[PDB]
């Protein structure tokens, strides 16, 4: 059994990673930070982990030696901050000091920063820490269910902004599926010290294709305001990354080999399609 | 169907009240505040309520007329601030008074009767009375998540590992209630004619427990005796330099020092609620 410490386990992605690690059969440790000890929902979430067999390990980002003691107990560290640069770098320093970690999987929110955005990867390299990066897809909770409307995570009402012509291919993935891929890949010899691209073919969609999925489920056409590229840029760092995705098509402008793509490496994961994802909000 | 607006529906108690309101068949409205829109947990929670039949009503505590418009749509307003983020509740009262249509207001007091400084604690109740707003108060019990699961220790919701502070002798009766049960009592009482303009006491008999009895339940569940430090009333007060409510509950016995009638006690009024006992509550921590 691979021993895995999940950092950020009360986050949106982190709590799905804990569940996926338990389901995959890893011996799963969850960092229990002091600050969330007074949050009743986060305490009951951690207790739902325990009842499924996870071990809670106490430590905090402000206590370097507590981070060292947590990572000294496992083979793999998985980090998911959706729920930050200094914090990942504090983890990197603790991992380097501990010396025992076989693989570190920092979450990058599915966003490849090598295309300074590179500070965490540069510290991983300089520390000699083995790793796997999972990149290449927008999380459906943040870009899909809102029809990619900025400034809101709620489903659309009658109107939407269409970015450019909405004909640029984006890659969407359910966070539940990103968590399964993380749990599958973290002891896969094929992905040690590799970038793994998450590109589920059925979820390669232009913004207009995503909109049309919504319109078909609600049986009604949305009012549309088209936002040109320079009208977008004249209204200004995620805003910059959003532009790279929806106007320059950075998630789809290069090919990926089967030996480095998540759905090919892990074809047992039946990833949720965006029509099934959006069905819940209609 | 009684129409109910729940204010604080992404909070701890408040999300349980929304659930119990839907369970009861109330036409359930939930205030959707702009400030939770950055929080995916909160957004998906509210969308879960909408999926179950709730109505989301956009409004903000800093926008008086948005609150008036919200309360003008319902018969009953329930508010619960535990886990959200006296002024907020007073803003709600102002909007209810101006709206004029609300048949009953149920402000959560976190189980703590403020009528036992005194005038600051009574500020909301005084504004309710001055506005002529009809109400139901629910009081008399410690929420188990905050006083039971942690064996009444400070600074954590987890039970201790091998050491407990015992207050006084731990022989003062306290009343404990599961937050889930508080929410069901709230949903059942809010259109009960019997509780209009009443204080309803929540006193589940099996959950009237001294702190030592509560510790003993945990020691039996774990099969280990805890190391005990006894804290006198004088030392507790000296270290205060919420703790005041704590002192009155665990040292003065203010939850159990008076009798309540059946016609004003939640488990008599609503005997269909099978309230959770503390042995069952604590087992999830083992």
Numbering used by the authors:
A (entry chain A): 9 to 91, 98 to 129, 143 to 263, 272 to 317
B (entry chain B): 9 to 93, 99 to 129, 140 to 264, 273 to 317
Report text from the authors:
Pinoresinol/lariciresinol reductase (PLR), an NADPH-dependent reductase, converts pinoresinol to lariciresinol and subsequently to secoisolariciresinol. Here, we present crystal structures of IiPLR1 from Isatis indigotica and pinoresinol reductases (PrRs) AtPrR1 and AtPrR2 from Arabidopsis thaliana, in the apo, substrate-bound and product-bound states. The crystal structures were captured in the apo, substrate-bound and/or product-bound forms. We found that, for all 16 structures we solved, each enzyme adopts a similar head-to-tail dimer conformation, strongly suggesting that each PLR/PrR functions as a homodimer, consistent with the literature that TpPLR1 exists as a dimeric entity in solution. Each structure contains a head-to-tail homodimer, and the catalytic pocket comprises structural elements from both monomers. β4 loop covers the top of the pocket, and residue 98 from the loop governs catalytic specificity.
Intriguingly, the β4 loop is well defined in the AtPrR1_NAP structure but disordered in the AtPrR1/2_apo structures. These structural differences suggest that the loops are somewhat flexible, and act as a switch to control the binding of NADPH and release of NADP+. Similar conformational changes of β2 loop and α10-helix can be seen by comparing the structure of AtPrR1_NAP_ + PIN with that of AtPrR1_NAP and the structure of AtPrR2_NAP_ + PIN with that of AtPrR2_apo.
